[PDB]
Enzyme design. Sequence first.
Site, PDB file in Angstrom:
ATOM      1  N   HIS A 177       8.376   2.132   2.671  1.00  9.92           N
ATOM      2  CA  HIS A 177       8.967   2.591   3.974  1.00  9.92           C
ATOM      3  C   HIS A 177      10.579   2.454   3.951  1.00  9.92           C
ATOM      4  O   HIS A 177      11.127   1.627   3.393  1.00  9.92           O
ATOM      5  CB  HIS A 177       8.583   1.659   5.161  1.00  9.92           C
ATOM      6  CG  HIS A 177       7.257   1.482   5.249  1.00  9.92           C
ATOM      7  ND1 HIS A 177       6.472   0.510   6.109  1.00  9.92           N
ATOM      8  CD2 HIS A 177       6.267   2.445   4.883  1.00  9.92           C
ATOM      9  CE1 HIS A 177       5.100   0.741   6.151  1.00  9.92           C
ATOM     10  NE2 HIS A 177       5.108   1.952   5.662  1.00  9.92           N
ATOM     11  N   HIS A 206       5.585  11.679   6.203  1.00  6.85           N
ATOM     12  CA  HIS A 206       5.468  11.482   7.570  1.00  6.85           C
ATOM     13  C   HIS A 206       6.951  10.706   8.145  1.00  6.85           C
ATOM     14  O   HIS A 206       7.386   9.757   7.395  1.00  6.85           O
ATOM     15  CB  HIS A 206       4.506  10.320   7.810  1.00  6.85           C
ATOM     16  CG  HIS A 206       2.948  10.663   7.594  1.00  6.85           C
ATOM     17  ND1 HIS A 206       1.908   9.989   7.345  1.00  6.85           N
ATOM     18  CD2 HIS A 206       2.630  12.032   7.665  1.00  6.85           C
ATOM     19  CE1 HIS A 206       0.876  10.940   7.563  1.00  6.85           C
ATOM     20  NE2 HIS A 206       1.141  12.201   7.400  1.00  6.85           N
ATOM     21  N   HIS A 224       2.375   9.778   1.629  1.00  7.95           N
ATOM     22  CA  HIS A 224       0.834   9.594   1.183  1.00  7.95           C
ATOM     23  C   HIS A 224       0.786  10.386  -0.028  1.00  7.95           C
ATOM     24  O   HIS A 224       1.278  11.641   0.084  1.00  7.95           O
ATOM     25  CB  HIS A 224      -0.305   9.879   2.301  1.00  7.95           C
ATOM     26  CG  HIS A 224       0.157   9.169   3.621  1.00  7.95           C
ATOM     27  ND1 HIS A 224      -0.720   7.936   3.773  1.00  7.95           N
ATOM     28  CD2 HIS A 224       0.955   9.008   4.463  1.00  7.95           C
ATOM     29  CE1 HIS A 224      -0.255   7.304   4.921  1.00  7.95           C
ATOM     30  NE2 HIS A 224       0.804   8.238   5.247  1.00  7.95           N
ATOM     31  N   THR A 228      -2.842   6.653  10.726  1.00  5.72           N
ATOM     32  CA  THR A 228      -3.774   6.948   9.722  1.00  5.72           C
ATOM     33  C   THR A 228      -4.467   5.707   8.876  1.00  5.72           C
ATOM     34  O   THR A 228      -5.059   5.930   8.099  1.00  5.72           O
ATOM     35  CB  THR A 228      -3.256   7.977   8.678  1.00  5.72           C
ATOM     36  OG1 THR A 228      -2.127   7.668   7.964  1.00  5.72           O
ATOM     37  CG2 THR A 228      -3.074   9.412   9.598  1.00  5.72           C
ATOM     38  N   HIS A 258       0.735  -1.310   0.039  1.00  9.96           N
ATOM     39  CA  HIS A 258       0.048  -0.142   0.069  1.00  9.96           C
ATOM     40  C   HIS A 258       1.105   1.176  -0.002  1.00  9.96           C
ATOM     41  O   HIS A 258       0.351   2.348  -0.222  1.00  9.96           O
ATOM     42  CB  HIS A 258      -0.976   0.048   1.266  1.00  9.96           C
ATOM     43  CG  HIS A 258      -0.357   0.084   2.442  1.00  9.96           C
ATOM     44  ND1 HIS A 258       0.143  -1.212   3.230  1.00  9.96           N
ATOM     45  CD2 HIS A 258       0.160   1.180   3.447  1.00  9.96           C
ATOM     46  CE1 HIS A 258       0.731  -0.686   4.346  1.00  9.96           C
ATOM     47  NE2 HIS A 258       0.902   0.631   4.215  1.00  9.96           N
ATOM     48  N   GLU A 278      -3.082  14.061   3.587  1.00  9.47           N
ATOM     49  CA  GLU A 278      -3.865  13.331   4.689  1.00  9.47           C
ATOM     50  C   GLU A 278      -4.564  14.604   5.419  1.00  9.47           C
ATOM     51  O   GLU A 278      -5.877  15.056   5.283  1.00  9.47           O
ATOM     52  CB  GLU A 278      -3.333  12.387   5.736  1.00  9.47           C
ATOM     53  CG  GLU A 278      -2.680  11.174   4.723  1.00  9.47           C
ATOM     54  CD  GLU A 278      -2.817   9.869   5.338  1.00  9.47           C
ATOM     55  OE1 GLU A 278      -2.095   9.621   6.315  1.00  9.47           O
ATOM     56  OE2 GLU A 278      -3.598   8.789   5.202  1.00  9.47           O
ATOM     57  N   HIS A 319       8.040   7.670   5.477  1.00 12.89           N
ATOM     58  CA  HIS A 319       6.921   7.302   4.236  1.00 12.89           C
ATOM     59  C   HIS A 319       6.335   8.428   3.829  1.00 12.89           C
ATOM     60  O   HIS A 319       6.157   9.468   4.242  1.00 12.89           O
ATOM     61  CB  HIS A 319       6.205   6.007   4.553  1.00 12.89           C
ATOM     62  CG  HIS A 319       5.254   6.377   5.624  1.00 12.89           C
ATOM     63  ND1 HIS A 319       5.450   6.100   6.997  1.00 12.89           N
ATOM     64  CD2 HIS A 319       4.007   7.087   5.779  1.00 12.89           C
ATOM     65  CE1 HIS A 319       4.579   6.441   7.841  1.00 12.89           C
ATOM     66  NE2 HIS A 319       3.632   7.078   7.163  1.00 12.89           N
TER      67      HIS A 319
HETATM   68  C1  LIG Z   1       4.381   1.484  13.482  1.00 12.96           C
HETATM   69  C2  LIG Z   1       3.516   2.468  12.770  1.00 12.96           C
HETATM   70  O1  LIG Z   1       4.111   3.646  12.949  1.00 12.96           O
HETATM   71  N1  LIG Z   1       2.542   2.237  12.117  1.00 12.96           N
HETATM   72  C3  LIG Z   1       1.848   3.307  11.137  1.00 12.96           C
HETATM   73  N2  LIG Z   1       0.695   3.145  10.410  1.00 12.96           N
HETATM   74  N3  LIG Z   1       0.126   4.356  10.382  1.00 12.96           N
HETATM   75  C4  LIG Z   1       1.139   5.347  10.456  1.00 12.96           C
HETATM   76  S1  LIG Z   1       0.870   6.884  10.102  1.00 12.96           S
HETATM   77  N4  LIG Z   1       0.889   6.944   8.471  1.00 12.96           N
HETATM   78  O2  LIG Z   1      -0.005   7.532  10.965  1.00 12.96           O
HETATM   79  O3  LIG Z   1       2.302   7.467  10.151  1.00 12.96           O
HETATM   80  S2  LIG Z   1       2.590   4.730  11.427  1.00 12.96           S
HETATM   81 ZN   LIG Z   2       1.498   8.057   7.132  1.00 14.75          ZN
END
Ligand SMILES: CC(=O)Nc1nnc(S(N)(=O)=O)s1
Ligand SMILES: [Zn+2]
Length: 258
Positions: free
Chosen positions: A65, A117, A94, A197, A62, A104, A92
């Site tokens: 990382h 993020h 979005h 998220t 999806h 987001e 990562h």
């Molecule tokens: C381990 C971890 O951080 N899992 C995540 N899932 N969503 C995240 S986010 N997009 O809000 O950064 S991080």
């Molecule tokens: Zn994120």
Amino acid sequence: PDWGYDDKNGPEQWSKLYPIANGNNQSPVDIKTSETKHDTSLKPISVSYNPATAKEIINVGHSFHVNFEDNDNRSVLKGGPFSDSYRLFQFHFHWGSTNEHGSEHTVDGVKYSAELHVAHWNSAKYSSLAEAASKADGLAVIGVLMKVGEANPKLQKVLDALQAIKTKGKRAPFTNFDPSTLLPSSLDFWTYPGSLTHPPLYESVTWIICKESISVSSEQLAQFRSLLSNVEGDNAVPMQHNNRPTQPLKGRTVRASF
Ligand SMILES: CC(=O)Nc1nnc(S(N)(=O)=O)s1
Ligand SMILES: [Zn+2]
């Protein structure tokens, strides 16, 4: 886990498998500048990352990382609303199916093109990321809004790495990289208590949203949108979008450091 961003298993359906999805501290949210509160207690955020902590890039289907070794306190975030230091573990992005709308978090109802993020976990309190992950003060994420315009040269190293992790489950060494090079010049911010998220959607994150955005060109975004969600050998299914719609504030307060 089997969840996604398509009509079938998307954000609008997540509630079905993960009740917390309808929680009171869900992310992302719309930041209304007229309703933010200046908090004189907020200190400047300080990032101190060691480039030798960069370890690998991986396609998780999806999204992709960039992981960092988190055995030490070589790369940490301090300051802001925190008393403790948070250990950097990953960054990562979005994006959405169009170059204009893929962030987001939104500001004054305005959706940006994409969002970076940078995640950290509370090493002062917990033993591992796994533990920290479902706790209220477990994670700290810095979000930086990206606005389509001029190409951004600091993204290059990340984009070139993408060729090697075309399909789901591919991974490659990614080293000697300081992610603070991706943050805007000024570190003024907004902060609120929220969550992950995407599933499992734990309400364990202290958001740090940067007031200043960074750029990116439409061709840079097109490179993210070109990665594949399938395993190698199978029919090609692009990673078209991975952003969740904003959630109700439910009486939370967005603090400003200015
Ligand atoms: C381990 C971890 O951080 N899992 C995540 N899932 N969503 C995240 S986010 N997009 O809000 O950064 S991080
Ligand atoms: Zn994120």
